[PDB]
């Protein structure tokens, strides 16, 4: 209820800084985003 009233305690500048740091890190690591599990995924059964 206090979070509903007093808003998000993380300021917009703080969240933008965190998001920007994550973007620059994941760009520096050449990270490929994880795709949605495809229907033609050949590893669905073993993960299941």
């Amino acid at each position: 209820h206090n979070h509903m009233k007093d808003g998000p305690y993380v300021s917009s500048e703080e969240a933008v800084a965190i998001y920007t740091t994550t973007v620059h890190w994941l760009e520096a690591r050449k990270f490929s985003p994880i795709p949605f599990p495809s229907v033609s995924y050949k590893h669905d059964t073993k993960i299941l």
Binding site: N2, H3, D6, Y9, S11
Partner: peptide, 8 residues
């Protein structure tokens, strides 16, 4: 305009 956390 300051931010008051839940714990203070």
């Amino acid at each position: 305009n300051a931010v008051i956390l839940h714990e203070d």
